[PDB]
Design an enzyme around this catalytic site. Structure first.
Site, mmCIF file in Angstrom:
data_model
loop_
_atom_site.group_PDB
_atom_site.id
_atom_site.type_symbol
_atom_site.label_atom_id
_atom_site.label_comp_id
_atom_site.label_asym_id
_atom_site.label_seq_id
_atom_site.Cartn_x
_atom_site.Cartn_y
_atom_site.Cartn_z
ATOM 1 N N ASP A 1 0.467 -2.327 -0.811
ATOM 2 C CA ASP A 1 -0.281 -3.154 -2.287
ATOM 3 C C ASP A 1 1.046 -3.498 -3.248
ATOM 4 O O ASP A 1 0.779 -4.654 -3.567
ATOM 5 C CB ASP A 1 -0.494 -2.444 -3.399
ATOM 6 C CG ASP A 1 -2.600 -1.313 -2.188
ATOM 7 O OD1 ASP A 1 -2.997 -2.646 -2.184
ATOM 8 O OD2 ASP A 1 -2.394 -0.659 -2.256
ATOM 9 N N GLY B 1 1.729 -5.498 -10.196
ATOM 10 C CA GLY B 1 2.071 -6.075 -11.382
ATOM 11 C C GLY B 1 1.832 -7.299 -11.855
ATOM 12 O O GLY B 1 0.878 -7.232 -12.957
ATOM 13 N N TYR C 1 -9.740 -0.181 -4.710
ATOM 14 C CA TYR C 1 -8.306 1.236 -4.752
ATOM 15 C C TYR C 1 -7.609 0.595 -6.642
ATOM 16 O O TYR C 1 -7.397 -0.508 -7.231
ATOM 17 C CB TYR C 1 -7.327 0.935 -4.404
ATOM 18 C CG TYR C 1 -8.038 1.712 -3.003
ATOM 19 C CD1 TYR C 1 -7.668 2.383 -1.757
ATOM 20 C CD2 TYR C 1 -8.074 3.240 -3.915
ATOM 21 C CE1 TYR C 1 -7.646 3.152 -0.979
ATOM 22 C CE2 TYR C 1 -8.627 4.453 -2.555
ATOM 23 C CZ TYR C 1 -8.029 4.144 -1.654
ATOM 24 O OH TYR C 1 -9.210 5.520 -0.471
HETATM 25 O O1 LIG Z 1 -5.049 -2.995 -1.513
HETATM 26 C C1 LIG Z 1 -5.052 -4.534 -1.176
HETATM 27 C C2 LIG Z 1 -6.639 -4.173 0.297
HETATM 28 C C3 LIG Z 1 -7.290 -4.963 0.031
HETATM 29 C C4 LIG Z 1 -7.228 -6.135 -0.850
HETATM 30 C C5 LIG Z 1 -8.389 -7.124 -1.395
HETATM 31 C C6 LIG Z 1 -9.705 -6.625 -1.110
HETATM 32 C C7 LIG Z 1 -9.413 -5.150 -0.561
HETATM 33 C C8 LIG Z 1 -8.075 -5.046 -0.130
HETATM 34 CU CU LIG Z 2 -7.495 7.439 -0.032
#
Ligand SMILES: O=CCc1ccccc1
Ligand SMILES: [Cu+2]
Ligand SMILES: O=CCc1ccccc1
Ligand SMILES: [Cu+2]
Ligand code: NA
Ligand code: NA
Ligand code: NA
Ligand code: NA
Lengths: 620, 620
Positions: A290, A297, A374
């Site tokens: 991430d 940020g 998330y």
């Molecule tokens: O957290 C990054 C992976 C992600 C990005 C966009 C949608 C679902 C999952």
């Molecule tokens: Cu988890």
């Protein structure tokens, strides 16, 4: 006047103008990263130079560039063309999130896969996931995203409840080609919704919760000067914000009598990775950084008074760049407040008759980010007694799949037909240490058990052992909870009144590190995550444990490359890198929206002060 | 009407009258322990019988007695004479605290030792420490305390700053003889004072702390009925108080829709021990069981509004017996309040547009005890999401010694000439489990790493393993932080909507267990402390991990004796015993009064609910 002040909208507008006039920001260019550079070591020169680092992507296929600009002098300092097959691709752009879904919607292989499942293409959302580096030779030097599909029954539906398993696609987002569509078979799309605001699912809301009112009638105890300089209960620090790392803490120091004593020069969460443990080819490539790939940020939330932050809140609103170099404000992106924290110290003495109680409190600096499913809260805490603590709060919606008939060793069942693959959330804290100055060393401290015998006739004695880490090649360390292992950062040239070196002790939570096989792609790209503690010699360009360009990098960048220099770290300017994380086997209670779970670390003074530092706290 | 109600003053007065008329409470008798007995299993009989257990000491040397009384029927149920050389001595009496100092003040060996050090006997305080069992054959069957001396320069002086090292005495407190005085040599008595309220030491008090006001305008969200029955946010429980264990939680249950679902039948801290790791003969015998030898409940503090407990506080004032059977109230001995606890769950969704935030809170039940130099807070927490947590807060004044010239491997230096011996603080939580009823089992859960190869071609997979503990002989378990080891208590006869057994997962802090040599006296008397987890079959008389009479017991009582029965624990009425503790190498910052340090454990639901249990929490 402070060189550590937050970037202003005017600075970002000047950067845009400098890049444009230098010919570096035409219509095909996008800014993928923009951030202020920290002052170099020995900046006791008063010669302020506000410099910015920029990563520039080209949507037409030309080579990207890394550019350093001086806003003070209005000049381009350097501009370098990047060979991305060698050094890695640039971070994912926000505007590429929708490109994956749009390209697949016109691909006949994708359409045939949805048709077999009787799914309307207008209802199919595609998550834009980072690609990693695996076996596909055609992906080297190309900018690839992978897509997993979820059904939205209506515009307000939670798509995460309806994964389309057995299907994945790979997309080149620059040439706009779908390189592969893999369909391993039809899985039923789980049918129950996951709409946590639907009254049919929540039932009637509780009417039993009475209000808790937290106020500060005389205002808060901290002051903010120069935009981002905090003073609170002998602490002082600068609160920075970077689009990659998020909140960064600079110049953490504690006023001990007449002396301002430094403790930490720079503290940040410098990387985070979420590896998935499902061997299905639909997801066995799935690992997202991430911080390094998406930039946490830039997805910081605006935090709401009374909901996100409760009490007497002071907000900071950091400014970042959009993809075209325009300044964009994150309104109320950082919350700052103090909190009561229970009893600080207490004693009732049977011989003196004195009853003594004092209350503790902590200063909180926090932000919340959202990347896809998330959501994470990042919390930094300063306590009255000199403790520094970090806490990550994980929530949001778990990433889902089908739950296979006949079970799974790598996926939990959350609802009929609905699975959640096992995964980890692993963070790297980068602590540029400055315990009473820059001459620091790290010692590893283990409990020592002793055998019953001469000098220990009753078999009760126990002790401890401290081992100094003297060179980078011996400074890659593992936790050992059973021996109470901790690490002490001390200054051998600064002694307390007992003639012992002043220090701080790092207390880890001792959670499992990276579980993947050591020969895996993710073990090579996230090597930092395989060990609990690393110590390097400070260097200006050694910023991230994974290197500068994480996206689609083949491996080995960052910490493994740094420590091969085997530099002296015994009484030198050093950086501690601490890996910590959560291993998540999802439970039914995590669905349809996950209650917060936490992980973190803390540092406590260890002979840094000459006695308790909170003797002057009043009786309240 | 509730059989779990707190003991009343009238009940204790009736017990006193029953004992007196039966001839059991003459002038030479003292009550060393008095407590209410829990209802027996299967008390669905409505036949209330309030019974009390009493330990009766005799100050003239006659044999002590254990007596059970029925206050409902006004009768003595049983009375047994104790052979203390066999089964252990009775707990230390509060009135014996001063006897040690008074007896030594007239002993010529003690006086000669103080004279050589030019110490005035009127200024010398003697700590009354429990004796343990070591090599002294003459102590078997005698009631012995050991004394360590501290100088008080004036009546308000902190004596702990002035230990008299090199000197210890052993005292028979029934025959009133000093059996031994051991003087191993003169150490300088440390001269600096430790008076944490002296302005010369504190300096001027801070004027920077602004008030934090926590109020509840509509009152608290919990209700208290029947004196001690709490209902709060679907939780319900009874708050008990026992003079040995302190706060005890009964009948913890959660209202899930229409069903009241039990979780824990009885939760308590059933023992605690502080072993010292200094091999000096002056202290190598030192291990005190605050719960089992001293009874932590009788030293509970009266807690002050605004200082000890902040917010909208509801107090309980438990009643205990004094040494003569008179009721004594502990005014404001238990604080109960709810606390805001940050974010409960949060998600901002890129596809549905819905932004969702909820706040968490916890219910707090706490008391504080003081035994000599140490003070401990015991905190039980209930959270909205079904989590149960325990936290111990250790503060007070560290136990001191001289710091030897030339250093020590087993003692920290706190001030010039002043040392603090290494030690541990180890607790035992006794959790009489009742997950959806009494048919429970325990499984040990380890992370499983997998090798790269067929079926795991990318080397990313990881899994977990669960091992059922089926008999007591295999239910003595060790922590393993590196494998993420946890323990799940489940009900194999109660399944969630996914047809999986409902459960709760115990998360330990994975701190070191007892460090002493396995052949030591303390390893035998505190055997519970050598392992992280024990599971036994429930039995009425198996109450404490160390047995009923801990003081001067030779070893092996309690858990090692229980598990030798090797009873079936697979789907049975079981009890989990969890050992957890702090290993304390004292730091300069701990002196002259220690800032709080904490340790604990928590239990979280694991497929106990059919989905998140906090979907009905309102938006605040
Ligand atoms: O957290 C990054 C992976 C992600 C990005 C966009 C949608 C679902 C999952
Ligand atoms: Cu988890
Ligand atoms: O905590 C029990 C040991 C103790 C008792 C009284 C004074 C000092 C120490
Ligand atoms: Cu301690
Ligand atoms: Na490469
Ligand atoms: Na440094
Ligand atoms: Na015995
Ligand atoms: Na039970």
């Amino acid at each position: 006047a402070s060189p550590f002040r937050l970037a202003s909208a005017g600075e970002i507008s000047e950067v845009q103008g400098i890049l444009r006039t230098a010919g570096l920001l035409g219509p095909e260019k996008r800014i993928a990263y923009l951030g202020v550079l920290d002052p170099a070591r020995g900046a006791g020169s008063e010669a302020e130079d506000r410099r910015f680092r920029v990563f520039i992507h080209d949507v037409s296929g030309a080579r990207p560039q890394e550019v350093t600009v001086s806003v003070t002098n209005g000049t381009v300092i350097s501009a370098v063309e990047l060979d991305t097959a060698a050094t890695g691709e640039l971070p994912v752009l926000e505007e590429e999130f929708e490109v994956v879904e749009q390209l697949l919607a016109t691909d006949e292989r994708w359409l045939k896969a949805l048709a077999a499942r009787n799914l309307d293409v207008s209802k199919v959302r595609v998550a834009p996931l980072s690609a990693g580096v695996f076996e596909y030779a055609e992906e080297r030097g190309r900018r690839i995203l992978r897509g997993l599909a979820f059904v939205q029954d209506f515009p307000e539906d939670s798509a995460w409840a309806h994964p389309v398993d057995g299907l994945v696609a790979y997309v080149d987002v620059v040439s706009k080609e779908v390189t592969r569509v893999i369909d391993t078979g039809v899985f039923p799309v789980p049918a129950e919704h996951g709409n946590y605001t639907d009254p049919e699912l929540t039932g009637p809301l509780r009417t039993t919760q009475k209000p808790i009112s937290i106020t500060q009638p005389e205002g808060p105890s901290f002051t903010v000067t120069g935009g981002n300089h905090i003073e609170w209960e002998k602490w002082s620090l600068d609160v920075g914000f970077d689009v990659r790392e998020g909140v960064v803490l600079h110049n953490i120091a504690f006023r001990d009598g007449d002396r301002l004593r430094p403790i930490i020069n720079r503290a940040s969460i410098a990387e985070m990775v979420v590896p998935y443990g499902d061997p299905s080819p639909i997801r066995s490539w799935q690992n997202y950084f991430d911080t390094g790939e998406y930039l946490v940020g830039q997805y910081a939330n605006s935090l709401e008074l009374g909901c996100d932050c409760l009490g007497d809140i002071t907000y900071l609103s950091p400014v970042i760049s959009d993809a075209f170099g325009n300044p964009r404000e994150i309104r109320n992106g950082i919350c700052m407040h103090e909190e009561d924290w229970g009893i600080l110290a207490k004693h009732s003495d049977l011989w003196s008759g004195i009853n003594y109680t004092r209350r503790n409190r902590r200063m909180v600096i926090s932000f919340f980010t959202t990347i896809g499913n998330y959501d994470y809260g990042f919390y930094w805490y300063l306590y009255l007694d000199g403790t520094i603590e970090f806490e990550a709060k994980a929530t949001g919606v778990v990433f889902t799949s089908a739950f296979p008939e006949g079970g799974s060793d790598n996926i939990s069942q959350l609802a009929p037909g609905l699975g959640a693959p096992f995964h980890q959330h692993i963070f790297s804290a980068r602590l540029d240490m400055a315990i009473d100055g820059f001459t620091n060393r790290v010692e590893e401290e283990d409990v020592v058990r002793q055998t019953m015998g001469p000098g220990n006739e009753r078999g009760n004695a126990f002790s401890r052992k401290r081992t100094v880490l003297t060179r980078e090649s011996e400074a890659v360390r593992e936790a050992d909870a059973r021996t109470g292992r901790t690490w002490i950062i001390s200054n051998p040239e600064s002694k307390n009144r007992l003639n012992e070196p002043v220090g701080y002790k790092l207390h880890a939570h001792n959670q499992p590190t990276l579980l993947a096989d050591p020969g895996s792609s993710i073990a090579r790209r996230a090597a930092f995550a395989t060990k609990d503690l690393w110590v390097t010699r400070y260097a200006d360009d050694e910023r991230y444990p994974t290197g500068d360009f994480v996206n689609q990098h083949s491996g080995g960048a960052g910490l493994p490359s740094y420590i091969a220099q085997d530099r002296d770290i015994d009484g030198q300017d050093i950086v501690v890198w601490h890996t910590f994380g959560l291993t998540h086997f999802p439970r039914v209670e995590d669905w349809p929206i996950m209650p917060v779970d936490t992980v973190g670390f803390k540092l406590r003074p260890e002979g840094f002060f000459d006695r308790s530092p909170v003797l002057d706290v009043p009786a309240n």
